[model samples]
Target: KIFKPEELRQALMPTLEALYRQDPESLPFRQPVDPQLLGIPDYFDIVKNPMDLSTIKRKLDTGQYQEPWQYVDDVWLMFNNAWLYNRKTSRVYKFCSKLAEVFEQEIDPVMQSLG
Candidate 1:
């Protein structure tokens, strides 16, 4: 199979935009995690590989994605990072946990084709 970045990107943009516009609680997931902003100096220790919607979008812009599963994995990474960093009862954790489900729902069509 050919690895055409644009093909995979075009298939995934709607799902990405949907998450980007999800809501206020999802705002944190929109950009890269800035440990300094949170003032929680050790976020990186737990979240070894940080990723976010904006990072994925940049890859979309540059057509840098190599696999459809990889594109999906980045979303999983960002969502899991939030869950790991924030307590289960915390707003970030609560919102992202559900948002990840929404992501799966919205991306189903794209994945069907990509799969």
Candidate 2:
């Protein structure tokens, strides 16, 4: 049931390179990716710069990583999806995320027939 093979590969390769570069001996799923970048471990400054995968590759090859990359194999109990559903809508009003959640909880008590 998995689509978007190319998209997934394009998205994952940089972080894969970083993880391997950080620790060749480290297991694939165990490697940690930067939370901010959501994958790459490099930090972003005031003016965000484009990611340079080749530079990252070079540093990893030469044992010159500027930041420490560790193993991340944690488990979670709950998940939350708060992203907007439609891109056509404006930034602020596009998503019915938290507002919808609150409305559903409040309205559920009043309209038990629709429940």
Candidate 3:
């Protein structure tokens, strides 16, 4: 399945919101903490880096991905940006990194098998 920026934005809403709620000070934004604003830093980088996405896409497109996992790819991309960019001391970064691990250990095996 092809993943888009909007798709990633929607997929990451809960995590983003929770991160802000847990500690608004952790984020680089002011009040409200709109997900759309983070969407760029979170997903736009993935979109611009075709190689990053196409690598995943090639696996999904040519591999056996017949299950309905609800935007797993989009979530992975969001996780990638969040993990790779954010520093370790930040709460938001830690949350995203851990979430990425969940997907990697639990879901990405299927994702990789398909590829």
Candidate 4:
């Protein structure tokens, strides 16, 4: 099944909500958090890097992060930025796909044009 951003979010809302209520520490996935506002160092920083890739991938693929939403957000950040070592969600997943079809349709040209 192909999933656009909104569609993905819509589909995941129920599970996300369950996590939020079950665990407050997991609220980050449902929304962004402010470091100063929460008096936290912005957990997003620690878990948003490639160094955390293995753990993030484990949770995402295994559904472990479903409990702590931040874990899920960390994974989302990874997906969003394509491991570019930057913290921008704008271009993340814009050309990704669960199937190879996107390669023939969009990724090929975009990648070829880049070089």
- Please name the candidate that would achieve the greatest TM-score relative to the true structure: 1
Ranking by TM-score: 1, 3, 4, 2
User: lDDT: which candidate is best?
Assistant: 1
Per-prediction TM-score to the true structure, in the order listed? 0.93, 0.21, 0.35, 0.26
lDDT of 1: 0.86
lDDT of 2 by residue, 29-95 (tens): 2322234655433323321322223433444455443222210100100001112212345331232
Steric clash pairs (candidate 3): none
Query: Which ranges of candidate 2 are over 4 A from the true structure?
Result: 1-3, 24-115
- Candidate 4: misplaced stretches above 4 Å? 23-33, 37-115
Q: Which pairs of residues collide in model 1?
A: none
Q: Which pairs of residues have clashing backbones in candidate 2?
A: none
TM-score quality measure for candidate 2? 0.21
Residue 114 of model 1 has an lDDT of 80
Clash number for every model? 0, 0, 0, 2
Worst 10 residues of 1 by lDDT: 20-29
TM-score of 3: 0.35
lDDT at residue 53 of model 2 (Cα atoms): 32
